[PDB]
Each structure stands twice: as C-alpha cells, then as structure tokens.
Design a protein around this motif. Structure first.
Motif, PDB file in Angstrom:
ATOM      1  N   UNK A   1      -7.581   6.313   9.708  1.00 35.02           N
ATOM      2  CA  UNK A   1      -7.231   7.734   9.704  1.00 35.02           C
ATOM      3  C   UNK A   1      -5.785   8.011   9.299  1.00 35.02           C
ATOM      4  N   UNK A   2      -5.562   9.153   8.645  1.00 33.74           N
ATOM      5  CA  UNK A   2      -4.230   9.601   8.275  1.00 33.74           C
ATOM      6  C   UNK A   2      -4.098  11.076   8.648  1.00 33.74           C
ATOM      7  N   UNK A   3      -2.864  11.573   8.714  1.00 34.52           N
ATOM      8  CA  UNK A   3      -2.580  12.919   9.194  1.00 34.52           C
ATOM      9  C   UNK A   3      -1.576  13.635   8.327  1.00 34.52           C
TER      10      UNK A   3
ATOM     11  N   UNK B   1      -1.017  15.075  -0.285  1.00 34.39           N
ATOM     12  CA  UNK B   1      -2.457  14.967  -0.076  1.00 34.39           C
ATOM     13  C   UNK B   1      -2.978  13.733  -0.810  1.00 34.39           C
ATOM     14  N   UNK B   2      -2.392  13.468  -1.969  1.00 35.19           N
ATOM     15  CA  UNK B   2      -2.720  12.287  -2.753  1.00 35.19           C
ATOM     16  C   UNK B   2      -2.398  11.049  -1.913  1.00 35.19           C
ATOM     17  N   UNK B   3      -1.202  11.030  -1.342  1.00 33.94           N
ATOM     18  CA  UNK B   3      -0.817   9.909  -0.480  1.00 33.94           C
ATOM     19  C   UNK B   3      -1.795   9.730   0.661  1.00 33.94           C
ATOM     20  N   UNK B   4      -2.222  10.832   1.265  1.00 33.22           N
ATOM     21  CA  UNK B   4      -3.170  10.793   2.379  1.00 33.22           C
ATOM     22  C   UNK B   4      -4.513  10.187   1.960  1.00 33.22           C
ATOM     23  N   UNK B   5      -5.050  10.634   0.832  1.00 35.61           N
ATOM     24  CA  UNK B   5      -6.337  10.133   0.351  1.00 35.61           C
ATOM     25  C   UNK B   5      -6.268   8.623   0.167  1.00 35.61           C
ATOM     26  N   UNK B   6      -5.210   8.154  -0.472  1.00 31.39           N
ATOM     27  CA  UNK B   6      -5.104   6.714  -0.762  1.00 31.39           C
ATOM     28  C   UNK B   6      -4.757   5.867   0.441  1.00 31.39           C
ATOM     29  N   UNK B   7      -3.879   6.351   1.316  1.00 29.51           N
ATOM     30  CA  UNK B   7      -3.605   5.621   2.553  1.00 29.51           C
ATOM     31  C   UNK B   7      -4.871   5.450   3.376  1.00 29.51           C
ATOM     32  N   UNK B   8      -5.701   6.485   3.436  1.00 30.43           N
ATOM     33  CA  UNK B   8      -6.924   6.406   4.214  1.00 30.43           C
ATOM     34  C   UNK B   8      -7.890   5.394   3.596  1.00 30.43           C
TER      35      UNK B   8
ATOM     36  N   UNK C   1       0.810  -1.215   0.000  1.00 30.55           N
ATOM     37  CA  UNK C   1       0.000   0.000   0.000  1.00 30.55           C
ATOM     38  C   UNK C   1       0.850   1.275   0.000  1.00 30.55           C
ATOM     39  N   UNK C   2       1.974   1.276   0.696  1.00 32.00           N
ATOM     40  CA  UNK C   2       2.815   2.482   0.719  1.00 32.00           C
ATOM     41  C   UNK C   2       3.319   2.869  -0.673  1.00 32.00           C
ATOM     42  N   UNK C   3       3.603   1.873  -1.499  1.00 34.80           N
ATOM     43  CA  UNK C   3       4.040   2.121  -2.870  1.00 34.80           C
ATOM     44  C   UNK C   3       2.903   2.671  -3.698  1.00 34.80           C
ATOM     45  N   UNK C   4       1.744   2.026  -3.621  1.00 30.66           N
ATOM     46  CA  UNK C   4       0.562   2.482  -4.358  1.00 30.66           C
ATOM     47  C   UNK C   4       0.198   3.921  -4.006  1.00 30.66           C
ATOM     48  N   UNK C   5       0.274   4.258  -2.723  1.00 32.23           N
ATOM     49  CA  UNK C   5      -0.115   5.582  -2.272  1.00 32.23           C
ATOM     50  C   UNK C   5       0.787   6.662  -2.828  1.00 32.23           C
ATOM     51  N   UNK C   6       2.087   6.401  -2.876  1.00 28.60           N
ATOM     52  CA  UNK C   6       3.039   7.454  -3.222  1.00 28.60           C
ATOM     53  C   UNK C   6       3.384   7.552  -4.711  1.00 28.60           C
ATOM     54  N   UNK C   7       2.882   6.651  -5.542  1.00 25.00           N
ATOM     55  CA  UNK C   7       3.150   6.776  -6.962  1.00 25.00           C
ATOM     56  C   UNK C   7       2.597   8.100  -7.433  1.00 25.00           C
ATOM     57  N   UNK C   8       3.417   8.861  -8.168  1.00 29.25           N
ATOM     58  CA  UNK C   8       2.941  10.180  -8.606  1.00 29.25           C
ATOM     59  C   UNK C   8       2.025  10.119  -9.825  1.00 29.25           C
TER      60      UNK C   8
END
Ligand SMILES: Cc1ncc(Cn2c(C)c(CCOP(=O)(O)OP(=O)(O)O)sc2=O)c(N)n1
Ligand SMILES: Cc1ncc(Cn2c(C)c(CCOP(=O)(O)OP(=O)(O)O)sc2=O)c(N)n1
Ligand SMILES: Cc1ncc(Cn2c(C)c(CCOP(=O)(O)OP(=O)(O)O)sc2=O)c(N)n1
Ligand SMILES: [Mg+2]
Ligand SMILES: [Mg+2]
Ligand SMILES: [Mg+2]
Ligand SMILES: [Mg+2]
Lengths: 524, 524, 524
Positions: free
Chosen positions: C152-154, C138-145, A301-308
């Motif tokens: 929750x994410x911060x 913010x993109x990372x936050x939306x997807x991590x959540x 999930x960390x990889x998926x989240x941070x892909x630009x």
C-alpha cells in the motif's frame, strides 16, 4: 556466549573487521575486549567518522561498520548520512543507548525515540526490545545495508545488553548469504536487447551505481557494441567510465532543458545506474524532445518510481550491465570520435586558475590516482581535464553536502593503499570536517589534500550574480591559514602561490611518506 | 508585499534582529536584500552556527534565529539540536528547500520528508504547503520556540516562495503577543505555601530553567526564608544559585542512590526548574528515602510526566519562584552548616592539575565572569572551586553533546559584551566544533578559550577503569597542536606548561582586546 | 489541461478503471466530472472500502485505487492497511486534504502531518508541494504500489489542486512501464539448481507471494520434478498449491519448535514467497535442526533481512518459480503419497461442528469456489477439509486483523464474477466490518457469507486456557442476530441450526443470484 561475543563473531563471519568510531560511555561495553582481528579507526567528530567510513565503503564496494555515541553523536553525523543516502553507501551505523533501567527516566545520554532520529536518511532504523535480540538485529542491519539498493542503516543498543547471554540459536545468523544479484527475465530482456539493436542513434547515460557495481568495463563493451556516445548523469557522485574513451561525452549539465537538448536526435537513450535525473539548477523545459525514448535500469525502486519519463527496470546494475554488454549485436555504425583535448588557459605568474591546477594534476599524478571533488565552482573543469582511465577514480558529495571529501579521501586511501588519493577541496568546504586530518596523521594514511583557496564561497557568489540578488551576507571566508590547521593536526603542509610552486609542491607531496596538505592560491 | 518583505517585518516586529547562518543556494533568495536593521553572524559549519545561536539565546534569554542549508546543513546541526532540546533553548531553525517545481524529481539539494529530519529533537517541525503560508508558518515557529517549555523548532522553506506575494492579512501576525507567564491558582498555591511553612527540614533543588527565567534572586530569597539547603540538580546545564551563598550545598552527583542519600532526613524537597532527575551513571537504589516527600515545579509537561516520584506543578518558573519567595514565612531555623573549603591539591612545577587551574581561574577572573564547561572529567572540581555569584555564569552541554562550549562561548560573549567569557574545554571536546574559532576572530568577539590538554578522553579512560573494561580502543588523542589551530583561524594563542606560565597567560588573556586561546598542559 | 484531467488520463493509461471510496468534501473536486470509463464502488466505512479494494487487488493481481476522506477516513482504514501491508497488496490510497490556503490555520478536515499518519503501514507516503506536482506524485504512487515487493501507498491531495493547470510535460508519465520482473543471474542460479538437484531429501515451503504471482502451476512442476513434499508457510494469507496434490503436506503450525521438527531429516528446504517464518504462538526451540539447510526466495528485502536462518535471494517470485521449475532435473525419487482424507466427525442432531460445515461446503461448492477465512478457531480444520485445486482460492487476514474477510470477499467476487466466493466468518469477526454487507447488496455482488455462530471469541477462550489465565473479561459475544443485520443492509438471509438446515440453506444460497448470508449455529 555473550551478546558481545556473538555479535563480533557475526561481524567477522560476514566479513566486517574494521570499526570507524568516536567513543562514548554507552559504547564502552561494546568496545571492551575489542577483538585482536578487528581494527578501530578513530576520528575526532562524527561527521568525520561517517565520511571516512563512507569513502572506505564506496571504494571497497563492501559494507562499513560505524559506532557512534547516542543521540548527540548520531546527530553530528546526520549531514554525512544525507550524502551516504544519495550514494547508496552500505553503512551500518550503530549507536550506544543508556542502560535499559535508566531509559524511562531519560537519564543523560538517553537517545529518545532513537529509531526516528536518523530518519529519513536510512533504509532501516531500529532499537531491539531485548538484549538477546541484538545479534539478530545486527544481522538485519548488515543485510539491509548490503541489499540493492544499498544504503545506510541504524541500530541503537542499550549498553547493558552486551554482557547478557546470547541465544544459542543465533549461530544460524553467522553464515547467511543474501543475494540481490538479479536481472530482467529472459523474455523481457530479449525485447530490450532488440530495441537497443534496432536503434538508429542510441545514447548511453551512466550513474554512480555503475562504478559501485564495478560495471564500468561492461559498460565500455556495451558502448563499443552500440557505437553509442556515453554521458555521465548530472550531479555525478562517481565516475563510471574512462574519461578519454572515444565514446565519452562528459558530465551532463544538471538541467531539464539542457538535458533534453543534449539528447535530441537520439531515438533510444539507455540510462544505467542513475536517478532520472539528479537535476540541480532551475532550467525548465521538456524532459525529452519528441523522437526520444528513454529506458532506465536502476537498482532503486524509489528512483524508478519518481522518474518523470521513460520506462524503467529495477535490478542489479552489475548483472544487467554484464548481460546487455554480452547480448547486444555489434553495430556497423562508426565508433564515436574522442573529444578534443581541453584548451590550455593563459596563466600568468600569479594566482592559479583552476584549469591550471587540474592540467598540472593530470600531468603529474599517477595513472591510477583517485580524485575527490569538493571544489564546487570548478567541477566542470575537473571533469574535462582529469584523465581517469580506471574504476573508482572519482568521488563527489552525492547530496551536495559539504564536509564529505576531506574525510572520505582518508577512507578511500585506507581502502586503496596502492592508489594515490588526491582530494581537491575549496577553502570553504575544507572547514566542515577539518579535524579528519588528524586521522590521516595518526593512522599514517598518505592522502594528499589540495586546498583551492580563493577566499570565498565561490559557487554561491556566482549564483547570487545569476539571481541578480544583491546585499547577500555570509559569502566570504577570509583569514584562514590552512598550513597552520594542518600543523595543528600533525599533517605536513605546503603552499603554492603560483604555477612554479604548484609543480614543486605536488612533486614533494607525491614523494612524501605521510599525508600532505597543499594550500593553493586560486583566482577569485 | 512579498513573502520576503512580510517575513522580515514579522521578524523585526517580534524582536529578532540577528541571523546566525551558513548560507547555501536554497537560502540565497531569503538572504538577498538583507535589511539594514539586521546583522548576520556567519560560522563555517552548522554545529557551530547552532552552538553560537544557542549560547546567544541562553544568555540573552530571548529567541535566536538560524538559517541553514537544506538537509545536509540541518543534519550537520543535529548534535547541537540535541543539546538545545535538553536546555529548553528558544531556537528558530530555518532551512532552505528546493524550488517547489523540482521537489518531486528529488533534484540535488531537495530536503526529502523535511519535517521528519530533525525529529525528535524539535518542538515543532514544518514545511508550508504554499508560499503565502510562509509568514504564518514563521509566526508559528517564533511562538512555538518561545512558549514554555522553550525549545528548538524547524521550518523548511522552498526557495521560490520568497519572491511570491504574501497574504495581505498576514499583517495581523506582526504584533501578536503570546504569554505563558502563568502560576498555580491561589487555592492550590496556598496549600503548597502551607506545606513549605510547615516543613521541619526542607531542602531545595534547582535546575537550569531557574537561570533561564532569571529566577535566581527569588530562589535566594526563598532559600533564605526557609533556611533551607540548596542543591543544583544533576548534569547541570546552567548555574541557578550563587555558589558561595551559605545555603548552597553544591552540584548533586547524577545517581539515583547518591541523591536519595543526600536528601535523607528532609521531609519536603522542593525542586524548581529541573527534570527529576537528570541521572547519568548507573547508581541503583531508592529514588527517595522514606520520610521524604518531593514537590516539583517544572515548565515542561514531559518532565512532570516522567518523574518517578513526587508531585508536580507545570508552570512558569519565573512566576512561580517570585510568588513562592514572597509568600513563604520567615523561618527561625539555623542556616545550613558552612561547607568545607576545597583543598589546595599537591602541585609540582610541571603539568597542571585541573584543581590548580580552577583555583587560579577563581583567583584571577572577574567576579562577573561567565564560564562554560566542556572538560568532562573535571566538572565536580570546577563546581567546587569557582565562586559564581551572579546569574548566567555557567553553561554545560545539556545533553552531554560535545561541540557545544566552544561555539556557545562565542554566542554568550556576543550577548554579554561586558562580561568576560571563559570557556574551559578538554582537548578531546575542543575538536568537535573547532572551526567556530573563526567566528570569534572575524567578529572580534573576545572569548577566552582554556584548553585542558591531557592527551586523552579522560572521563572515558576513567569509566573504562571502573567497568574493569580492558582493551578499549580510541581513548587517546595525542598529537594536536591547539596554538596552531588557533593561528589557523586567526585567534591569538598562548601556552601554559606550568603554574607560572598559567598565571602569566591568564594575565595576558584578560588584558587582550580580542579572542584568546590558552593551551594548558594538564596531568593524566 | 487541468490536474484533474491529467490525473484521470494517467490513471486510465496505467490500467486503472475502478475507484473504491467513501466520499467527503475534500474529495468532491476530485470526484466531480467522474469519467464515464470509470466505476465508483461505495462502501459505508473506510475499513470496508479498503478491505473491498484489498480483496479486489489480491484476486485481480493488479493495483486497486482508493479515495478516502482526510485524516478521519484514513484513520478508520488503518487496521485494514495493517493486513494489506502483510499481504503485499498493491493499494493506491488517496485522501483529500484541505485547500492549501486553510492548511496553516488547521481548519476542520485538515490532515495534519498527513504523510506520517499511515506510517509505518505503507511503502511510500506523500503530500505534494504544489498542484502541478500532483500527477507526478500519482505516478510515483502507482509504481511504488506495483513494484516488488508490492504494497500500500498513500497520497494526500489538497482539494484545490484539481482545478489548477497541469504541467504539459506530465504527458511523459502516461505510458511509463516499470518492471521488477527479475531473477537471479545465470551463474548463481546454476549453483542453486545444482544444490537442488544434489539434495537427497528436499522439502518446499510456499507462501502467499506465490499465489499473488500466479506461480502456483510452476511450483507444482517444481515439486513434481524434485518429488518433494510441499508445505504452506504458517499464518498463510493465501493458498499457493493444490491442497489435494500428492506432494501437499498442509499448513505449517506457527511455532519455531514445531517447524524445525517438521523439517528434520530434510537436507535442503526451499522456501518460496514467504517470510521465514510468520510464527505466532510461543514455541521456543531450534530454528532448524542439524542437517537442514534453508534457502529462501523472497520478493521482499525486509523478509530476507529478518530471517533468523538460511540463505536468501531477493527476486520476483513469478520469474524465479518459472526458471527453477524449468531448470531442475527430474528426480528419480518416488513421488510423495497424498495425505489421507480427514476423518468424519460424529455429528448429532444439534449445533454443527466446524468439521461438518467444511465437509459439507466441500461437497456442495463448485470446484472453482473461492474461500475466505475469518473463523479463527477453525483454520486448521478448514485447510484439511477444503479441496482447493485452483489459484486464488483462499484468503485470510495477513496481519491477523479482523474485519478483512467480509469486505474482501466482496472485492474478490467483484474481481472474479464467474467464481463463487464463500466467506466463512466467526460471529466475533463478523461485526468489525458488518456494514460492508451494504455494498454487496447495492452493486449486486453475489458473495455468500457463512457466519459461524458459537457466541464467543472462541480462539481467545481457548488461549485463555492454555495460559491458565482466569478472570479474563470480554471473551463472550452473546445476543447478535445476524439475519437481522443482513436484512438491515438488504442482503437475503438464511439460518442453519443443524445439518439438514445447513444443506438446504447452502443449496438455496448457491442457486441465488445475489449476495446471501447464512447464520450457522456451531458448537462452542
Ligand atoms: C553542509 C553544507 N553547508 C552549506 C552548503 C551550501 N554550499 C556552500 C556554502 C558552498 C560554497 C563552497 O565553497 P568552496 O570554497 O568550498 O568552493 P568554491 O569556492 O569553489 O565554491 S557550495 C554549497 O552548496 C552545503 N552544500 N553543504
Ligand atoms: C558528540 C559527542 N561525541 C562523543 C561523546 C562521548 N564522550 C567523549 C568522547 C568524552 C571525552 C571528552 O574528552 P575531553 O578531553 O574533552 O575531557 P576529559 O579529557 O576531561 O574527559 S566525554 C563523552 O561523553 C559525547 N558526549 N558527545
Ligand atoms: C481488529 C482486531 N481486533 C481484535 C483482534 C483479537 N482477536 C479476537 C478478538 C479474536 C476472536 C475472533 O472470534 P470469532 O468468533 O471471529 O472466531 P472464533 O469464535 O472461531 O475464535 S481472534 C483475535 O486475534 C484481532 N485479531 N483483530
Ligand atoms: Mg572558495
Ligand atoms: Mg529524524
Ligand atoms: Mg582530555
Ligand atoms: Mg465465535
């Protein structure tokens, strides 16, 4: 039964039978009465302990168990843990803590705020609140390390816990099976398959989690079906594809602009088992050119989240690669043409060009050799000149942390006793974990270490040149005799000052019964 | 001005002229245009970099500045930081981070959650939110390391910050002077002095912060005035008192019961510059016997808070020792009874007994020699057998973390070029930071390394015995040739297989013009 | 485009149109030029902001966006985050930070070490290293959540970042689609299906992630096919099954012994979307009795790791429930018989029994009513006496943190305009987040609040008994006039001191067009 007894039963029932360690007094009550069906592999410094365990885990595709000494021992290993994090290596790192009655006074060898020490380099990090909780905490550690995305975990155990009575209900832990082997639901998987079938010019990019999942063969079938060229994602920790397969296009440069240019004209780019992307150099530009759509399958999930950019699917790489390989249509497009054989660089009778070393290794090494790379100025040439047909044939420090390849090569060789391991390591990198050589000698693990000696931190001197940065100290490492270091730790040593001597030394190393170090004089 | 220029100006104005490092690409923009008034000390692995810096800081009694590479380099040093924390060493650890533009994608060499990495082993850990803040953050690091209780701090800097414009108002940082040279208020100091004057049978216990503060002479005066026996607090990282002064009683054993026994009968025990207490072995019993009151002077609130007995005063050790020494009355009590002489142990013409080695060192070493100890099974005998009459004469890994003495001995020798450093290191301990030898060779720092080779982790083999722990693996370390390791790194090597050879080797070593390693064959 | 513009575009493109907030000066640059297509929901304290957002996210089954003020605002919300962590609520928590230029001096309103503040109650916590990074973060936050397991994410953002230039390449973020809608591979799913088909007396246990996934109907089909009894896992935060369906067996008591007794004789127990198990009271015994095997399907690796027994599968609950429901055979076993209706309690003319309130709510409330429970001593009676036919009909603080139901009831009502929300809250619990009432009044959100007033912390006094613990202070909460509190915040208020009044008040409340609070006098 005791906590000790219950814990070793849990370990063996979960398939663990090897402890990689460097012992201390807080660990003696764990190591006492060491079961005969277990094996202990000692290394002389903790970066080496973890490096060896890491190679072992990556090659075996199973968790490896580590026992270190309190905070100092854990701390000595934290550079090794940075690599393990980036490679998703399933490492169960345990460390001994002071007896509970002496923790409050912070006696010597008390690991203060223990769970925080290895953060942020572990998936889970814990110290149990009682002795009877230890087996359950160990169970959590095993499964946290093993579940996708795999990675290192940390467990601190007060040494007085081991002798205490275990909870009889801990028996429920022994045979637990925990699965992450999941893939996209049918409806959305069909949508993906259709997008792949509809692509006019698809490309495939593979990362280390493919090799970890042994998804390589399924990726070959996928690439053949789609008639798609196949890259390896940048900063590659492993090799996920046969390097002389006709679709193979090699290692992507680790730059934003360079990668969008490479992918220009490909309408759909499917990335499997890689971050998007592990860039390195500053190479600003577009993440993708217009006309290119990217779809990423990742276990993390960390990889998926941070892909630009791109869509992402978070799932097991093995299950996804297999499903796709067997679902996509056979394209009528022409199969890609194999890349040309790298050119032979001119080589005088003097110091060796790295291109020469790799060509010679390729000529002489067995077809199922396993290579490790910690020769940072020569990575591009290595990827171009070594034919690696099989899975698990290449490892490179996943976070760029030096001190990995030498110990990892020993763990890999222990994991694959029938495949010759050859670590190619620069003279600078060689020193970080030099004492690991002793473990190869002691346990009769016949790894070959090729030291590329050019007297400098090559890649650093080069980059300083790019930065036009003048007056940089600390870039040269003259005056190291690597044959003497090998002798110090009981490893046979050879020298190669030219091509003829390189051929002779490699011939001798390949035939030797034990580990061998070859010091190669290479061009600056 | 640039952040680079401003930062180097801040460093010089704050007294820093030496950078201890192992370089990386994130650090090249900092190390470029390295100023002519600075010197760089390179070591080959980060535990070595930090260990050398630590020795240098401890001996010089001033902060040392370190530059490491991102997460991997910082991680490799975290065992060394565990010792530095326990020794209150003023270490300013900087690490390079990826360019701000590539932190989000977690490009290779990104230090993720950087400030959390070295916790809990640092006083302060930080990554600035902008390039312009860097000089201010560096100022904070310098002062947080330097203020009582001194300790390591950590600063992560994105490599693109250095070439950016600094805030012109950063000039106010340059000449800031921050003091924590404080002592107890007069009213309460007079109460303490009265208690000391009124005591019938006072005892004094001294810890490492006395030697750090160079409070040794004032403690001698205090002890002479009170006619009081003087102990060194257990697990001693430094030597705070002349070891053949008539008041000196020796090193306390690191056990609860042992120490209360030693203190029995003493109505007032004054502890200065030590934790209360750095116990180690399980030795349950009374913290203090009835009739004993304890008063602790410590520079560290964490020490004061965790003491399980006694009153405490949190203040500067130098200021307090000076004040007490000059305020207490001269007692007419008799000095402590002369301590017995250590026996000359039986010794044949074969392998050497540790006691023989220490007696021979004591006969042949200069009066102002400086010893380091990482021969863990022999510490008690070492303290009994070496006459160390000057400050700064002894160092031992403060957290029990092996890998300290070899590199620290080089740092100490660099700080004290006119005092011969002699590091006595076990064959096990020697491997943890073996590559440090290279720095001694390269910079011609004339440390003498005495390797006590008995082929085993001796203290663990001993403790295994007392635990009646059977079948403990990993306690033996046969097959290491230390003369070859020394040759590998360019350091002269000698061997001592018996007493005659020991005497000859030491004679030769003391006459040498550079570093020397002596491998001594010791008994099991 | 500015970071402000780019971020709002990212938000709308990812489906966010509502901001739940309590504003501050670090947040004004974000909230300025608030876009017409968004709505802002203000609450007067941060525990209320987050509770409302939490209710909204849970009922809408989509992420909720939150904007809080620096450390103090975030801090005020951390209890609410405790609950959100346990309920896997997808909350994007943003907080404003000082301007980057003033962070170093720790100006007022600086959030120091910001990312550490909400740990360990968030999936991901971050402060970007530059303004241009903000949209990507913010993109990372939306997807991590939003990825399984949701949570929750911060994100901390320096207030000066908003006006800066965005990276044009940020547009790649806008349309990213990230899926974790995955299920067990066919081969292993067939094995699981076979085990279920072969079971002689299976039982099913369902947790909150079933309701979150709207997998309720599939679980009904699965239960009917297997003819299996269905329990709700203990400490239930949501209701995953129709409570009057013949298979329904009710809420499991939260004890180890009680649950293994309940499952005795069941050979296979399938647990879906629940921790194994959220025990509460101390009730030691067997985790399972001999003859029972447990299989858990969970969206959360942390749950799978810590289960003390059983096999586990980590996958999406929706995808797994649907597949199982459609693959299992129709068993020939007899369908379970529905639990009998609960008995009527004797109700005199005085204060009401909670049993009477629930009976009466059940008779008057619409069939698609949604209930929230923060009346801790009456939970069992509530589960027995309320007929909840539909998904999303019940919420209870997932971490047992009081202050959830009052604000969450407002969020749920906002998310489900056509379903009557009825929060049943104890007089103790009512005070934690009392100011949330104002939001219901101001936005005319027609929640009904039923206050159970017994003038004490009922559940604690009970527990005080079973504990035989006397002289415990702080258990009584006399002297609160809830009608006056309601009037204070602008909400219509009614009283009920007996059954006749209860009926009349409920009748008026259901007919009302705004929020209503009813203070009910209940028995001790
Ligand atoms: C633990 C650690 N320390 C320092 C570095 C920095 N570093 C250093 C010092 C390199 C030079 C390696 O030199 P080598 O001789 O092993 O290889 P080349 O000479 O081919 O560059 S490459 C590099 O990233 C690192 N990556 N990891
Ligand atoms: C970094 C680290 N690793 C492991 C240990 C555990 N340990 C170990 C392995 C010791 C044996 C040292 O052996 P030596 O040969 O240096 O000295 P002796 O043989 O006299 O014990 S003493 C000790 O505490 C430690 N303290 N620090
Ligand atoms: C934020 C917070 N504070 C305190 C508690 C402890 N607590 C407290 C103080 C309870 C009493 C609730 O009283 P009530 O009037 O809301 O309901 P009953 O009277 O039916 O118990 S139940 C409980 O767990 C908690 N769970 N959460
Ligand atoms: Mg080199
Ligand atoms: Mg840490
Ligand atoms: Mg030894
Ligand atoms: Mg109440």
């Amino acid at each position: 039964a005791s906590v000790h007894g219950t814990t070793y039963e849990l370990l063996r029932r979960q398939g663990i039978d090897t402890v990689f360690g460097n012992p201390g007094s807080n660990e003696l009550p764990f190591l006492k009465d060491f079961p005969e069906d277990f094996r202990y592999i000692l290394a002389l410094q903790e970066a080496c302990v973890v490096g060896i365990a890491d190679g072992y885990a990556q090659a075996s595709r199973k968790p490896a168990f580590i026992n270190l000494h309190s905070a100092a021992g854990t701390g000595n290993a934290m550079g090794a843990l940075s690599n393990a994090w980036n490679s998703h290596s399933p490492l169960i790192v345990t460390a001994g803590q002071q007896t509970r009655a002496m923790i409050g006074v912070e006696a010597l060898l008390t690991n203060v705020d223990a769970a925080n020490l290895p953060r942020p380099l572990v998936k889970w990090s814990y110290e149990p609140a009682s002795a009877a909780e230890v087996p359950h905490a160990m169970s959590r550690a095993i499964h946290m390390a093993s579940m996708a995305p795999q990675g290192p975990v940390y467990l601190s155990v007060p040494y007085d816990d081991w002798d205490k009575d275990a909870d009889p209900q801990s028996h429920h832990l022994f045979d637990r099976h925990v699965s992450s082997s999941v893939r996209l639901n049918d409806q959305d998987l069909d949508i993906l398959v259709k997008a792949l079938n509809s692509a006019s010019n698809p490309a495939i990019v593979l990362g280390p989690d493919v090799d970890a999942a042994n998804a390589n063969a399924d990726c070959v079938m996928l690439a053949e079906r789609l008639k798609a060229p196949v890259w390896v994602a940048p900063s590659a920790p492993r090799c996920p594809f046969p390097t002389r397969h006709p679709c193979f296009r090699g290692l992507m440069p680790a730059g934003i602009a360079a990668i969008s240019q490479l992918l220009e004209g490909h309408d759909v780019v499917l990335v499997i088992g890689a971050p998007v992307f592990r860039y390195h150099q500053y190479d600003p530009g577009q993440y993708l050119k217009p006309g290119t759509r990217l779809i990423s399958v990742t276990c993390d999930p960390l990889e998926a989240a941070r892909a630009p950019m791109g869509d992402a699917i978070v799932a097991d790489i093995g299950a996804m690669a297999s499903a796709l390989a067997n679902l996509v249509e056979e394209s009528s497009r022409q199969l890609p043409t194999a890349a040309p054989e790298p050119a032979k660089v001119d080589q005088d009778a003097g110091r060796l060009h790295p291109e020469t070393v790799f060509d010679t290794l390729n000529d002489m090494a067995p077809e199922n050799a396993i290579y490790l790379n910690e020769s940072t100025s020569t990575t591009a040439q290595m990827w171009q000149r070594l034919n690696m047909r099989n899975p698990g044939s290449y490892y490179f420090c996943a976070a760029g942390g030096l001190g990995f390849a030498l110990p990892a090569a020993i763990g890999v060789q222990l994991a694959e006793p029938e495949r010759q391991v050859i670590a190619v390591i620069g003279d600078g990198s060689a020193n970080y974990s030099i004492s690991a050589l002793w473990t190869a000698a002691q346990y009769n693990i016949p790894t070959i270490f090729v030291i590329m000696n050019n007297g400098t931190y090559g890649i650093l001197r080069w980059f300083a040149g790019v930065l036009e940065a003048e007056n940089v100290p600390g870039l040269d490492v003259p005056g190291i005799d690597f044959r003497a270091l090998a002798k110090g730790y009981g490893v046979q040593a050879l020298k190669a000052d030219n091509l003829e001597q390189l051929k002779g030394s490699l011939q001798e190393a390949l035939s030797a019964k034990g580990p061998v170090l070859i010091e190669v004089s290479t061009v600056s």
